[PDB]
Amino acid sequence: AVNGKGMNPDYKAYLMAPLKKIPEVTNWETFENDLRWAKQNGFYAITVDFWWGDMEKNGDQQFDFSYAQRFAQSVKNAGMKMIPIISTHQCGGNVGDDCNVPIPSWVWNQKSDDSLYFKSETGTVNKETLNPLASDVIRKEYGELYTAFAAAMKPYKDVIAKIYLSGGPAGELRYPSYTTSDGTGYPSRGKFQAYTEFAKSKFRLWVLNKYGSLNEVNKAWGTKLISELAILPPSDGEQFLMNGYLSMYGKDYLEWYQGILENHTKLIGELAHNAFDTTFQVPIGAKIAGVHWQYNNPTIPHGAEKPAGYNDYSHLLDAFKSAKLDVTFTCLEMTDKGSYPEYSMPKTLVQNIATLANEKGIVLNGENALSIGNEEEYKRVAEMAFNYNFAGFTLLRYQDVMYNNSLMGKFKDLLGVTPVMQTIVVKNVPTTIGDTVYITGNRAELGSWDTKQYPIQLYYDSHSNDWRGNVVLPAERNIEFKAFIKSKDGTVKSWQTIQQSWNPVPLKTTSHTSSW
Numbered sequence: 001a002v003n004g005k006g007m008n009p010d011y012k013a014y015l016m017a018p019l020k021k022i023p024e025v026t027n028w029e030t031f032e033n034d035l036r037w038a039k040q041n042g043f044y045a046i047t048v049d050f051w052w053g054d055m056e057k058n059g060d061q062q063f064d065f066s067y068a069q070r071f072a073q074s075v076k077n078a079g080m081k082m083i084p085i086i087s088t089h090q091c092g093g094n095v096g097d098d099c100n101v102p103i104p105s106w107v108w109n110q111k112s113d114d115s116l117y118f119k120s121e122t123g124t125v126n127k128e129t130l131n132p133l134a135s136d137v138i139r140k141e142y143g144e145l146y147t148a149f150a151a152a153m154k155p156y157k158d159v160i161a162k163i164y165l166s167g168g169p170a171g172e173l174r175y176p177s178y179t180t181s182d183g184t185g186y187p188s189r190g191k192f193q194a195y196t197e198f199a200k201s202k203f204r205l206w207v208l209n210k211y212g213s214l215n216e217v218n219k220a221w222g223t224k225l226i227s228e229l230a231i232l233p234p235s236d237g238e239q240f241l242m243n244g245y246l247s248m249y250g251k252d253y254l255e256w257y258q259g260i261l262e263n264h265t266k267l268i269g270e271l272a273h274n275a276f277d278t279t280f281q282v283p284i285g286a287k288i289a290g291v292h293w294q295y296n297n298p299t300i301p302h303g304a305e306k307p308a309g310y311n312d313y314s315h316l317l318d319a320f321k322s323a324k325l326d327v328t329f330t331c332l333e334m335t336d337k338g339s340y341p342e343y344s345m346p347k348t349l350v351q352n353i354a355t356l357a358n359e360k361g362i363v364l365n366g367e368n369a370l371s372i373g374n375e376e377e378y379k380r381v382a383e384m385a386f387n388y389n390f391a392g393f394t395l396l397r398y399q400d401v402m403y404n405n406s407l408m409g410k411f412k413d414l415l416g417v418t419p420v421m422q423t424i425v426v427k428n429v430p431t432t433i434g435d436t437v438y439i440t441g442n443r444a445e446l447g448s449w450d451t452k453q454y455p456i457q458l459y460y461d462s463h464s465n466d467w468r469g470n471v472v473l474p475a476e477r478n479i480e481f482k483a484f485i486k487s488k489d490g491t492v493k494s495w496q497t498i499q500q501s502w503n504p505v506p507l508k509t510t511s512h513t514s515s516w
C-alpha cells in the first residue's frame with residue numbers, strides 16, 4: 001500500500017439494503033436467508049436507510065420505529081450486524097432512486113420564511129432535505145429524532161456496528177447543486193444554492209460581521225458598493241467560476257458557502273454523539289459526495305464541486321475530525337478521463353481525499369458510485385481500498401449480487417476478504433548501506449506488482465540477520481509475491497530469484513520464510 005504499508009487491519013465489507021421496505025421487495029424469512037448468504041460471502045454488516053418520512057410521518061413527535069425494530073430483529077436472527085442511516089433526506093429524485101419517501105410534510109409549516117429550503121441561481125426550489133442554514137429547526141428536529149431512535153434501538157444495540165447521519169441530499173454532506181429540474185445534472189457545471197431571501201441575508205450579515213461595515217467590506221474587496229443590500233451571492237455563476245472566485249469577494253463567498261456545511265457537520269455530529277455515545281459506543285459517520293465531473297475543466301476549474309459546496313477539501317475534513325465523525329467517500333470503482341466535455345477525474349479525487357484523510361488520522365470508508373456488473377470494477381475498488389488504507393467498503397446494492405451468484409463470487413474473492421497478520425521473512429538479501437527491501441505481489445493487497453508507490457516495506461532484524469515484516473494479507477486467498485531491493489536513490493537494484501507463493505494465506509498467524 002502507499003508508503004510501504006499493507007492493507008488496513010480493520011477492513012470490513014458491507015452491503016447496502018434495498019431502498020424500499022423488505023416486505024415490498026421480498027419477505028422477512030427469505031431476507032434472513034439472504035443475510036446468511038451475504039455473510040457467507042464476506043459481508044460483515046448491512047447498511048440501511050431509515051427514512052425520516054417514515055419514522056415521524058404524521059406529526060411532530062409522532063414516531064413509528066416499528067419497521068426499524070422489526071428489521072433489527074431479522075438481522076439478529078440472521079446472525080449479522082447492521083449500520084443504520086438516519087435518513088433525514090428524501091428518497092426518490094436522484095440516481096438509482098426506486099422509491100418516493102419525502103421528508104415529513106408538517107416540517108415545512110414550521111417556518112413562514114424560505115429558510116428551510118434551497119433556491120438555485122435560476123430560482124429552482126429544492127426541498128429534498130432541510131437547508132443547513134435553519135440550524136434552529138435542525139437542532140430541534142434532529143436532536144429529537146436522534147434521541148427517539150436511540151431509545152427505540154436500545155434493545156438491539158448488539159447488532160448495531162455503526163451509525164450514519166445524513167448531511168443532505170442523498171445522505172451526503174453537500175448542496176443539491178446537480179439536479180435535472182435545475183438543469184445541472186452530470187456532466188454539467190453545478191449551480192449555487194444560496195438564493196433564498198434567507199440565504200442572502202445570512203451571507204450579508206456574515207460579511208458585515210467579518211468586516212464591521214460596508215466601508216471596510218469595500219476596502220477589503222476593492223469594490224464600490226453603495227448599499228449593504230448590494231452584498232449578494234454570485235449573480236452570474238459561470239463568470240464566478242471562470243475568474244470571479246479568484247477575487248477577495250470570491251474567497252469570502254466560498255468560505256461562507258462551504259462554512260455552512262462545516263458548521264452543519266459539527267452540529268449533527270454533536271447531537272449524534274450526545275444521543276448515541278453512552279448507549280451504543282459505536283463510531284458515527286457521514287458521507288462526502290464524489291463530484292468528479294468538470295474537475296480539470298480549463299475554463300471553469302472544479303465547476304461542479306464548488307457549487308456543491310466542495311472548495312477546500314482539507315478545511316472540510318477538519319470539520320469531520322473535530323466533530324469526531326468517520327468519513328465515507330464514493331467513486332472507488334471509477335477511473336480518470338479528464339477529457340472534454342465531462343472533464344471527469346474520479347480516481348484522482350479519491351486519491352487526494354484518501355491522502356488528506358490519512359494524514360489527518362480520519363477513518364476512511366468507501367462505496368461504489370454506480371452498480372457493478374463486471375469484476376473489472378471490483379478490481380479497481382480493490383486497488384484503492386487496499387492501497388489507500390480504507391477501513392471499509394460498502395457495496396451498492398443488495399439486489400445486484402444477491403440475485404447473481406457469479407458476480408457474488410467475484411466479490412467474495414476480491415473484496416469479501418478477512419485481513420490476517422503474517423510475518424514475511426527473507427534470507428540472504430545482498431544489501432548495501434542505503435538499500436531498503438520490499439515485497440510486491442499479484443493481488444491488490446500486495447500492491448499488484450507495483451514497485452513505485454504500492455510495495456510493502458520490510459525491515460532488517462539484527463538479531464536473526466534478515467529482512468522481515470508483519471504484513472496484513474487476505475486470509476484464505478492464494479497469493480504470489482517477490483522481494484526486491486531499492487537503492488538509496490529510490491530505484492530497483494534487483495529482484496528475488498524465485499517467485500514466492502502462499503496457497504492460500506493461512507487463517508491463523510504464522511510466517512512465510514524464503515531465501516533471496
Ligand SMILES: OC[C@H]1O[C@H](O[C@H]2[C@H](O)[C@@H](O)[C@H](O)O[C@@H]2CO)[C@H](O)[C@@H](O)[C@@H]1O
Nearest residue numbers: 230231232233234235239240244247249
Ligand atoms: O456582493 C457584491 C457583489 O457580488 C457579486 O458580484 C461578484 C461576481 O459574482 C464575481 O464573479 C466577481 O468576481 O466579483 C463581483 C463583485 O466584485 C454579485 O453578482 C453582485 O450582484 C454583488 O453586488
Ligand SMILES: OC[C@H]1O[C@H](O[C@H]2[C@H](O)[C@@H](O)[C@H](O)O[C@@H]2CO)[C@H](O)[C@@H](O)[C@@H]1O
Nearest residue numbers: 049091094095096170171330368369370
Ligand atoms: O442507500 C444509501 C443511499 O443510496 C443512494 O444514494 C447514493 C447514490 O445512489 C450513489 O450513486 C452515490 O454514489 O452515493 C449515494 C449515497 O450513498 C440514495 O439515493 C440515497 O437516498 C440513500 O441514502
Ligand SMILES: [Ca+2]
Nearest residue numbers: 060061141144
Ligand atoms: Ca420532532
